[PDB]
């Protein structure tokens, strides 16, 4: 069996837009992806609410710096055949600059980490699939939750695409199959979450 790290934020954890509680496992994208691959791959879910690509954020009960946690994830789960990273939604929070630039820079740093990590064995370098999260939409007040800007979130797909092409990795736009909930303008309902896991099965087969 191939092994896959599914690395992300609360969209990967599976936060309900209304309650903030976790979606049933049957609807979480990493579990869905694994079920879709039907015994080919084992998917290790590592979705942390508030996680950024590479920016400290102490507003939660656990460390939100994606790069530090990615290193731990790589060590815990190596050897890995594929790493999938869906991040950027928190990098466009005002505290982290409010713009897509910080998300693409951080994603480039995570790619370099995956590429150059000291794996056991050294030859076990995983492939990488960079996933753009679905863009934000108008929340109830007319804007997305957390002061995020819609137009900046919409820049993540083309910037991540261009980054993946530069670095020689794969890209998928989760916004092409799923939309943010209008309950908060940011998070995904169960249906949209499961549609991401289903949609990722195809590229994950091309890659593996």
């Amino acid at each position: 069996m191939k092994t896959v790290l599914a690395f992300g934020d609360s969209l990967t954890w599976g936060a309900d837009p209304a309650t903030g509680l976790r979606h049933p496992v049957e609807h979480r994208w990493p579990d869905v992806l694994e079920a879709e691959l039907a015994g080919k791959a084992k998917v290790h879910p590592e979705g942390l609410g508030g996680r950024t690509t590479c920016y400290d954020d102490h507003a939660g009960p656990a460390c939100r710096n994606g790069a530090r946690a990615l290193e731990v994830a790589l060590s815990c789960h190596m050897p890995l055949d594929l790493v999938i990273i869906m991040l950027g939604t928190n990098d466009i929070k005002p505290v982290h600059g409010g713009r897509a630039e910080a998300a693409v820079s951080g994603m480039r740093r995570l790619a370099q980490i995956v590429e150059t990590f000291i794996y056991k064995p050294r030859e076990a370098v995983p492939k990488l699939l960079i996933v753009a999260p679905p863009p934000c939409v108008a929340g109830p007040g007319g804007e997305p939750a957390g002061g995020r800007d819609i137009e900046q979130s919409m820049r993540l797909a083309p910037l991540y695409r261009k980054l993946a092409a530069e670095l020689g990795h794969h890209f998928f736009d989760a916004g092409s199959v799923a939309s943010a909930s209008p309950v908060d303008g940011v998070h995904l309902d169960a249906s949209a979450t499961a549609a991401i896991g289903r949609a990722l099965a195809a590229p994950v087969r091309d890659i593996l």
Copy 2:
């Protein structure tokens, strides 16, 4: 005798908008609060210039992360009957996002820290009073010192009020009794600082 922690930033330290030097003790809000309580409470002042709710900031001579310092203050001064926190003014600096969202997320974290800290004895869980600082005002340039946004500072009161209600803690708006000085748009003169100490006496007495 009740014990109270007064945890804040230079508004709590008592920074003179003019000199940047410290207000005399008689005009600092923690001391004024203690004097107004006429011997019923001991108030421990912990006001640090530049302190944020939960964001690292290395531009001063001392750690500005409110969450880390709060844990230290809770341990040094426990058992505490009440924690009063007045923070947010630095969270709206441009480097921390320039917006109120970061402040309220950080205040939620500080509230969680107060609730769940490992106290000696464990049952000594303090009550919590969340205080919105007075908003910034048009400074001598037409803008508050440090690039802070007046509009964003004015969102702290309503967002903190909702937060306090959600978590079942207490709220007071210091802007209801005091305004920032036009000298720099941010800090409080001696009578505005004393005004907060006096106004906090009523709710603190009710809470204790």
Copy 3:
């Protein structure tokens, strides 16, 4: 299905004593434990080489502080029914003091973290099983690898037992079913590793 976090160091990752490469998944204690529970529970493996209970160690490619990583693990995998922690082998390295005291202190800190974490939902507080790792034995040179002391490693079982009794959690001594390899005096061969996963099924059933 119940959910279980399996939190540890390279003994939990499954390092081969000779090569340092990972044991086949069939022999890793978290996978074995899950297979033994036969659909009752899902076990999330989080075994990181070099991990300590609560001590920084920058000698590896990823963060080794168990407490910081435990917080991330709890957020990624909550709601959890049970956390199992097998740590201490690295806490008795000379750099961390060379003695069992540091391991028991750190384990107490991890227990407090599990108890008091801000879970979604708040009511989802997991049970805890504290696992003492098998003691070190004479490596090739007459002593265990890494300057570890045999007699100190042998203190982990009784100290962890007493800690678990104090805190009202469960305890298992992995040394009662598995022995360190003489190849390095510290790590576990595949057989000893799998015997730990098999042996844990019983207490894990009593607990769940």
Copy 4:
């Protein structure tokens, strides 16, 4: 009126040897010192259980690095006439080397911090009194709690005295006043604690 910072660990917080609960205020050394000074001085207590001179220690609920917390305490309480530091008891724990060298090196760093801090106003440089804590004694089992070495704890007085003379600051040996409790070999009962505050009045009065 003069202001004094009383910076230490659980000996300064006032941990009861038997229970770990805080001594009553009238038996804590900072409070006793203030009462003896009879209105010459206000003393700000900053005693944190587990605090080291300058060493990270994550086994507690709050940061134990004395240097980082000292910077915070200076900023919160400046302008200060005098800083009193009683630390070293935790630096001789095995995790921090088990020896007195680390305590004296750390005290040097703390003295440097007090000397060179960016005070408001810049010329308000406090005087410094370096205090050797009372040496450990045999606890119930025959040695002090926490793996501490009696012989090493007895070196702090001579080493701190030489350090104080070298840097041109003041020294006081709290061990020449009171002794550690045999209840755990490390902490101070309420009358030993009060004795230290009383004995401190005279030299503090002279320094001020």
Copy 5:
């Protein structure tokens, strides 16, 4: 012979605007400055791509916090006759607030660090030259690389000049010598870089 520390970011390292590769040594400003000083001084280059004044930034392969690295550079190269700091270009990135206030606050902190550092010998306090980097210009797409704001970059000169006068140090506007390259709006070509080193000789000669 005098010694000089040249502390900066990729403008000091010498990043070519088109390729990102290092300019040849004879076109790097520190080397050019040393050649012009004609044996009066040795200049130690410490230019790190991405370096901010005092802000953590984890998007690169090395620490970008200027304050922490400045302490290291002072210790490595002390005793120093003069410190030259050219920073600010990264502090105006959106992730760090997008504005000049953070650069000037950070420069103040760096100046404080140089003034108050524990030098060997203690009296070897270096002089300080604060350098405003050349302002950003429109890149190919119409604005500078990295989301930087031209208007904000133009504030560094007046703000640094006022800061330098306030603290009693020297100021030099590198922007009054050379301009950012329109290849990316931010970095300096080899002849602009050399021009800054040449222009620095005269004031450095006078300061020394």
Copy 6:
């Protein structure tokens, strides 16, 4: 012209065992090495008092973690043909374990960092020379300064030699040409320091 990084601690800075002040430039090993190479190499000295291989140590005025600083040195001075590292003397302080194991684990990490760093251009991967510092000697008390163990310092050469051979890098034992001074048991006098610079010329020439 080749470029060489000379990365170390106060032995590399050139600490006078007597005064603690810096050796004249003519007697520092990096400068002596550069002079011996008679214009064929540029040697960048980066020696920091108290530096460890990879362990935080807050007892000085600057960060002592060798790994973090190495990343900074690699970025500031790349492209580099060769990195020379002489570290270990501080890793054997009691606070870091008092033993050679920590030093060799940290040297492995530093070697990994040199190998895998994101260089500009990526193909500019330096060669590596690992240098064992001269062992500690009986100081004026009969023991080396700082509680260091002579026996443990003597293990650095054989452990580093094996490490270098395993990783396919170069090794030199500075103890083969120099001894620590009996003045403090730890530091090197001016002729011992120069002796290392001269002896390193042969292998450095062969490596380049």
